[PDB]
Amino acid sequence: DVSRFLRLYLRKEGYDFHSSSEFEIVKAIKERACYLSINPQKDETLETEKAQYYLPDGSTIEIGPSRFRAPELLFRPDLIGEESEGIHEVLVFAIQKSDMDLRRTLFSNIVLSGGSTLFKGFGDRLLSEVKKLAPKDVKIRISAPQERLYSTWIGGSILASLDTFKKMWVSKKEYEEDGARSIHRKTF
Amino acid sequence: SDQQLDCALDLMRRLPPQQIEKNLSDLIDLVPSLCEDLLSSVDQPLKIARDKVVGKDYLLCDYNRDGDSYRSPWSNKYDPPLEDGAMPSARLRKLEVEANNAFDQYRDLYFEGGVSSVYLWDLDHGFAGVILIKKAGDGSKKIKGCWDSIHVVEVQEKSSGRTAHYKLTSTVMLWLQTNKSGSGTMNLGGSLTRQMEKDETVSDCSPHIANIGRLVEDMENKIRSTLNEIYFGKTKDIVNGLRSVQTFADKSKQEALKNDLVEALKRKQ
Amino acid sequence: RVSDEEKVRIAAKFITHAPPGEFNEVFNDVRLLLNNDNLLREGAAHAFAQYNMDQFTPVKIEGYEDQVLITEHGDLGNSRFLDPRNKISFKFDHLRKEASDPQPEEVDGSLKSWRESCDSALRAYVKDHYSNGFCTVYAKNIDGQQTIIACIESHQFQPKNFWNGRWRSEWKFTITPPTAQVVGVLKIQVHYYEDGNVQLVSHKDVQDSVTVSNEAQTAKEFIKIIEHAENEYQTAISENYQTMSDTTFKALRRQLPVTRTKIDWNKILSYKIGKEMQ
Amino acid sequence: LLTLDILKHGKRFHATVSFDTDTGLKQALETVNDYNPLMKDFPLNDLLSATELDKIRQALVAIFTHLRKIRNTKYPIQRALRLVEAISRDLSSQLLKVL
């Protein structure tokens, strides 16, 4: 969706990309030409260096302001026009809707994963946002391993390689006996 | 001397729950011929033992009191060294070690520490066990508490088909203190006991132990709840009913208008 | 086998811990048990004297309809507590719970002005905040010091509702004129046993002072310190009861686990949660 | 063992641990070893060529005294009863030809 909103901003820049096999080029631009501004507004009130971009075709696109406001969507889904929340609010609400006896432990252990957590200045902006929402003088700690793209897979490799996985799965026989209810029963 | 026993039980009933052990020993020191007649219905705290070979803890009651030894469920050994005790069924020994495991999980989830134990024994068409849980307050903290729980459970398994009849009897022997500045010292004793019985279907996903776990969980939730609201609120009501904070003749005004509205409500009947 | 002299300490231990409003029942369960009324006669008689001198026992005065309190701080031996109100001496059967000999006590005169002064102010106070309260003020020239031992007691003995409770309150109005370090104690014992057993035992070691300025000023000012500490203490106790589901009990046993969900017994028993992995 | 080393060196612990746990060979061998002295040197031949009843008397006592070592090897109930009936089967066969 960040790529989609980036496509909209590229149209507003003047460059049009609307083919389905061109939306992928928009993803490539998101993966190698966007960053996250620390100050969300102070940087918007300035004219950046407007770095270029080489298409597979061989053309040239000067982006400009459409590179930091594009992943800004994750922290404010008002730009897409939606009453949802940012990432920081998802973390703070996920922590605050828990037992009050575990908040400090959760703030001291935050792990990022997923490819969208690879933007430049992502973790730093997340720290700033969480500090603005967490209570005062609570150690906030965001970890960010080097395998955020492979976090869920490596975790699957560790989990399924254990002897308890034999008792943790659902056998085919069981599925033929009970059905889908067996899966919802043993969903964890 | 049967009336003497009835008055003795009522004396323990009204005895202060701070010195249950000492005063129970004193009452036994009166008529020691009635001693192990009282140690069956007089609730007292538990005794912590120490499994030497495993490095765990296990509580003491009459069900683990094999002869005059105690069957440590972490080792299935008797302490004092009685090599003539009544070992449980090997089947029930495996069921008991998983029982101790599940209740360690239970204890860790609600009590966040504390000591627990689950012993077992037979029945013709089932089996029966006891569940001991003893949580002393945080010694580092000033709250000197001591949660004590005993759960007499009797699994009356039916014929076949894996449906049972789970009879359960519980007991909670609370203990509390706070050295708060607003209250000085606020000691708070207390004890409960309930019974419940359900016939939950047994299955490969629903073993007996899981049914017992749900019953013990629900029972303790009800007891802790019931205590906190009913009994403790009742004590707060008693202290408020004794002495009121509002000055009298002001309460006469509010009670005056209260009786006025009493007449108003019972006026349009 | 246990001797007879230890039975005195046993009966003393059972009477000195009897809850309010339940003394007679402890007496029945100790009379039908110790089997020797002579042993408990002497030993338990001293225990009765203690249990009735310490807990500010409500004693009825048939002559003036006052229902004075027997406080430890006043006696002349054979249950001869000196009633400060009406200046009458009296005997009292600790068991019959009926006083005797309302002889007009020829008090030596210690702080009788302060006695009825602070007593009067405390009568007003009791009639203000105590429903079934009782005041009694002991005036004494204790060890070369003039003091007022104002005592407050309220209770409710409702056996049909399976509960009791006896607000007891003492205020040593130390008449140390330049600095009356009014230090007393407000002990409370509440019992409730409907389908169970619950006992509340508390006390606040109140410590406060004021210069003995005048008599009426320190009488109502003594009431000011009293109303302060008592409103404070009762309110604070109520809020301790308010913050108990989440703090005290959570020190003992949480209502719900830290995961805020029930227990999937099927999960724990079926497989190990991953506790083996760290 | 070389195949097992391949699966261990290739970080695949499944077949390696299951080669000893999923196979009930370990528990089968331990029960086998529990019954191993009990099955070696069994005096059934004393019952085979016994036509005289006195030979059968001493033979029966000998076989049961050798069978007395089932106190230390956990012998089952119904298994022992069918065992006894098997002993009586051969006793009957011997007596049939004896008559």
Side-chain angles (χ1 to χ4, degrees), chain A, chain B, chain C residues 1-277, chain D:
Chain A
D1 187 80
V2 178
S3 172
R4 178 174 299 171
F5 175 61
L6 194 153
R7 185 180 70 182
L8 177 70
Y9 268 175
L10 284 186
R11 177 179 292 179
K12 286 180 183 178
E13 289 287 335
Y15 306 94
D16 53 344
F17 302 93
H18 64 281
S19 176
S20 67
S21 65
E22 188 170 354
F23 178 77
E24 291 290 325
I25 305 165
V26 178
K27 268 175 66 176
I29 293 171
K30 181 179 71 72
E31 291 161 353
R32 59 174 281 176
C34 296
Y35 66 96
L36 279 170
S37 75
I38 311 164
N39 281 319
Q41 297 173 355
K42 306 296 189 292
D43 307 334
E44 188 178 0
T45 65
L46 288 170
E47 195 270 329
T48 183
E49 65 272 19
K50 299 180 70 69
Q52 298 175 358
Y53 184 69
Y54 286 164
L55 289 173
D57 151 69
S59 304
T60 293
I61 305 166
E62 284 195 350
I63 297 99
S66 173
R67 61 193 297 164
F68 63 94
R69 287 181 181 176
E72 178 66 27
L73 171 66
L74 294 177
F75 292 150
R76 183 179 295 182
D78 307 338
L79 302 178
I80 202 65
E82 178 177 353
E83 285 185 352
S84 296
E85 301 91 3
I87 295 298
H88 65 289
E89 278 170 340
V90 167
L91 276 180
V92 175
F93 295 168
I95 292 165
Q96 290 172 354
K97 289 181 184 179
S98 62
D99 275 320
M100 187 267 179
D101 298 328
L102 284 173
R103 289 175 181 171
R104 302 178 68 86
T105 60
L106 292 176
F107 275 113
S108 293
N109 286 312
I110 299 171
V111 178
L112 305 183
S113 67
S116 307
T117 63
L118 292 167
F119 293 105
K120 286 180 66 180
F122 178 71
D124 303 335
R125 185 169 169 86
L126 190 59
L127 275 179
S128 62
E129 285 286 328
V130 171
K131 280 188 186 294
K132 289 185 177 182
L133 275 176
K136 290 186 179 182
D137 283 327
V138 174
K139 181 183 74 174
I140 303 170
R141 181 176 185 272
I142 293 172
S143 67
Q146 305 299 311
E147 294 84 3
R148 289 171 279 172
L149 292 173
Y150 301 151
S151 292
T152 56
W153 197 79
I154 288 167
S157 177
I158 290 176
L159 182 63
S161 65
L162 299 177
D163 298 330
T164 63
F165 191 75
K166 297 181 175 67
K167 297 181 286 186
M168 202 175 182
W169 62 64
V170 178
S171 71
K172 184 184 177 181
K173 172 179 70 69
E174 186 68 31
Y175 176 65
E176 293 183 353
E177 289 182 358
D178 306 340
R181 300 182 295 110
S182 65
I183 304 153
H184 293 288
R185 183 185 303 165
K186 204 190 290 182
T187 179
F188 297 110
Chain B
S1 178
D2 206 350
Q3 64 87 28
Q4 204 171 9
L5 183 63
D6 291 329
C7 294
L9 285 173
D10 180 72
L11 194 64
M12 296 305 299
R13 183 77 48 80
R14 306 191 179 201
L15 190 138
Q18 288 76 14
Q19 294 74 226
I20 313 101
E21 301 164 351
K22 282 178 91 285
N23 297 327
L24 180 56
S25 176
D26 293 326
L27 199 67
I28 277 168
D29 285 331
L30 260 68
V31 191
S33 65
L34 299 178
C35 168
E36 292 184 353
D37 303 325
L38 283 177
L39 294 174
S40 64
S41 68
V42 175
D43 298 332
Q44 72 175 356
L46 304 176
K47 302 291 186 181
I48 300 169
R50 188 66 186 83
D51 196 354
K52 298 293 183 180
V53 292
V54 192
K56 300 286 284 186
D57 279 328
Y58 64 103
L59 296 173
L60 308 178
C61 78
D62 195 10
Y63 299 106
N64 60 355
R65 190 172 182 174
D66 195 354
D68 282 333
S69 286
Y70 300 107
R71 191 172 62 82
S72 173
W74 306 108
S75 63
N76 202 1
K77 307 300 186 291
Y78 298 107
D79 210 2
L82 283 180
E83 292 173 352
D84 304 326
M87 286 290 181
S89 302
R91 170 188 178 87
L92 271 74
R93 174 57 180 162
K94 179 64 175 67
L95 191 64
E96 184 182 3
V97 70
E98 61 183 358
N100 295 309
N101 196 3
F103 284 90
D104 260 330
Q105 283 298 111
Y106 177 85
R107 176 190 52 82
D108 196 5
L109 287 175
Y110 291 100
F111 298 93
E112 297 172 352
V115 177
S116 59
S117 294
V118 176
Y119 306 104
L120 284 172
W121 61 94
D122 58 349
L123 176 58
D124 308 334
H125 47 274
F127 65 102
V130 70
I131 296 165
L132 298 171
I133 297 170
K134 178 163 173 61
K135 171 66 179 295
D138 299 337
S140 64
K141 284 299 293 178
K142 71 174 184 182
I143 299 99
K144 300 181 184 65
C146 178
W147 178 275
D148 297 318
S149 295
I150 304 172
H151 304 278
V152 174
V153 67
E154 292 179 353
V155 175
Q156 184 175 359
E157 184 184 1
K158 289 185 179 180
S159 64
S160 66
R162 289 202 179 277
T163 181
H165 185 66
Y166 298 102
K167 182 173 171 63
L168 173 61
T169 302
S170 290
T171 298
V172 163
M173 296 172 284
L174 199 58
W175 171 259
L176 285 180
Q177 271 201 0
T178 60
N179 310 124
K180 198 182 264 80
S181 173
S183 69
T185 64
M186 188 179 179
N187 193 355
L188 185 59
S191 70
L192 262 299
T193 289
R194 291 292 180 271
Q195 288 191 2
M196 189 176 178
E197 194 159 2
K198 200 169 291 297
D199 302 328
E200 191 171 359
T201 302
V202 191
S203 76
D204 293 334
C205 290
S206 171
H208 293 288
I209 171 173
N211 305 315
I212 298 163
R214 284 183 294 275
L215 286 173
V216 172
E217 186 180 9
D218 291 331
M219 178 55 67
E220 285 182 352
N221 291 320
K222 288 183 185 294
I223 293 170
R224 181 190 173 280
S225 182
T226 303
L227 266 162
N228 189 18
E229 299 103 18
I230 303 299
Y231 290 174
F232 287 149
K234 181 70 174 177
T235 53
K236 183 180 89 275
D237 293 333
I238 289 165
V239 181
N240 284 321
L242 283 175
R243 172 181 174 267
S244 181
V245 175
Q246 305 297 320
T247 310
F248 194 71
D250 297 334
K251 296 194 74 64
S252 80
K253 294 191 293 180
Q254 300 302 313
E255 283 180 353
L257 286 171
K258 188 255 182 63
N259 294 320
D260 294 330
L261 287 172
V262 155
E263 293 170 352
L265 183 270
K266 299 197 287 186
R267 177 179 288 171
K268 295 176 71 68
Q269 288 177 350
Chain C
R1 184 69 190 96
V2 176
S3 69
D4 305 333
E5 51 191 356
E6 303 185 4
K7 301 302 179 190
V8 162
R9 292 199 291 263
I10 286 171
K13 194 55 68 185
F14 288 170
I15 294 157
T16 48
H17 297 302
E22 292 187 353
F23 165 69
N24 300 115
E25 293 80 353
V26 171
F27 174 69
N28 281 321
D29 303 340
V30 80
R31 176 179 178 85
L32 301 174
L33 263 70
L34 194 52
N35 208 3
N36 192 359
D37 298 339
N38 297 318
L39 286 170
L40 70 88
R41 178 268 326 272
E42 280 188 357
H46 179 267
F48 294 151
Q50 300 310 111
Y51 178 75
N52 298 323
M53 274 164 61
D54 62 358
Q55 289 188 357
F56 300 161
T57 291
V59 61
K60 172 64 180 176
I61 172 62
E62 203 271 331
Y64 300 99
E65 299 178 356
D66 306 325
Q67 190 78 41
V68 83
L69 305 173
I70 287 166
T71 301
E72 174 184 358
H73 302 279
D75 196 358
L76 270 179
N78 195 0
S79 181
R80 288 293 190 182
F81 316 106
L82 276 67
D83 187 359
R85 184 180 291 174
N86 311 317
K87 272 72 61 182
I88 44 178
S89 176
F90 65 96
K91 187 189 261 74
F92 171 70
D93 192 2
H94 289 286
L95 286 170
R96 184 185 177 90
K97 298 183 282 183
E98 182 170 358
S100 297
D101 196 4
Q103 193 175 8
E105 171 60 33
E106 301 81 1
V107 73
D108 300 322
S110 61
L111 299 78
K112 303 305 285 181
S113 172
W114 288 96
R115 180 264 323 172
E116 203 64 30
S117 176
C118 293
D119 187 76
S120 304
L122 193 47
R123 290 169 84 193
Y125 181 72
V126 162
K127 289 175 182 178
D128 282 329
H129 298 175
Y130 286 91
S131 300
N132 296 318
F134 301 102
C135 173
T136 295
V137 168
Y138 282 0
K140 183 186 280 180
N141 305 322
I142 177 169
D143 65 8
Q145 299 166 355
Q146 288 177 351
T147 63
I148 279 299
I149 298 162
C151 301
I152 312 164
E153 189 276 329
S154 177
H155 70 280
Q156 285 294 104
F157 295 162
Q158 295 192 1
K160 282 187 180 291
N161 297 111
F162 309 98
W163 59 268
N164 287 310
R166 184 175 179 181
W167 177 280
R168 296 179 291 111
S169 173
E170 184 169 356
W171 283 88
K172 292 192 269 76
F173 180 55
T174 61
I175 296 186
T176 59
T179 295
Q181 286 160 351
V182 190
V183 179
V185 70
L186 283 71
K187 300 188 284 182
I188 300 165
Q189 184 174 5
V190 169
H191 175 65
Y192 178 68
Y193 61 98
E194 180 180 3
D195 201 1
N197 192 355
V198 172
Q199 286 191 357
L200 173 69
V201 170
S202 175
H203 63 89
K204 179 185 280 291
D205 305 338
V206 295
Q207 177 187 359
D208 192 1
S209 184
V210 62
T211 296
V212 174
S213 178
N214 285 320
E215 191 170 4
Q217 286 189 356
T218 53
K220 70 182 180 182
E221 194 180 9
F222 174 65
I223 300 302
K224 288 178 76 68
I225 287 173
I226 281 171
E227 69 204 2
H228 169 73
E230 290 192 1
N231 290 313
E232 181 75 27
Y233 183 49
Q234 180 177 0
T235 306
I237 282 295
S238 65
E239 284 107 24
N240 296 130
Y241 275 111
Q242 185 53 251
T243 72
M244 193 163 286
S245 71
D246 54 349
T247 307
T248 326
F249 283 150
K250 277 182 89 286
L252 283 185
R253 180 189 187 276
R254 291 172 60 99
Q255 182 169 355
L256 281 172
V258 299
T259 66
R260 280 178 177 268
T261 183
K262 290 296 176 66
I263 299 174
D264 188 2
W265 296 101
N266 194 359
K267 177 185 264 76
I268 295 176
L269 295 175
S270 296
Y271 69 99
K272 270 73 180 174
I273 197 58
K275 192 175 179 182
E276 303 285 326
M277 178 178 65
Chain D
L1 284 175
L2 188 147
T3 66
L4 296 174
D5 293 334
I6 289 299
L7 291 174
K8 285 177 73 171
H9 192 273
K11 288 182 181 178
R12 293 194 176 185
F13 297 146
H14 294 270
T16 72
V17 177
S18 69
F19 187 73
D20 292 330
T21 59
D22 203 0
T23 63
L25 185 62
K26 184 66 188 296
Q27 300 177 357
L29 283 170
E30 72 181 358
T31 306
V32 149
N33 291 320
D34 196 359
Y35 288 109
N36 203 353
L38 260 293
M39 202 52 66
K40 192 171 182 177
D41 196 6
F42 189 76
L44 198 145
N45 200 4
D46 193 4
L47 176 148
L48 288 180
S49 69
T51 54
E52 183 190 2
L53 294 172
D54 291 329
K55 298 177 175 69
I56 297 169
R57 288 175 62 234
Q58 303 169 359
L60 190 142
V61 176
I63 297 171
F64 296 157
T65 49
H66 182 270
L67 284 175
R68 189 176 288 273
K69 296 298 180 183
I70 57 102
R71 183 178 289 275
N72 304 107
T73 58
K74 195 259 178 185
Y75 206 80
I77 302 98
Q78 300 292 320
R79 187 172 295 168
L81 299 167
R82 291 286 88 85
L83 166 145
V84 163
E85 291 190 355
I87 291 168
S88 183
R89 284 192 179 102
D90 274 329
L91 167 65
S92 183
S93 67
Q94 291 285 324
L95 284 178
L96 256 57
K97 187 178 273 287
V98 158
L99 295 178

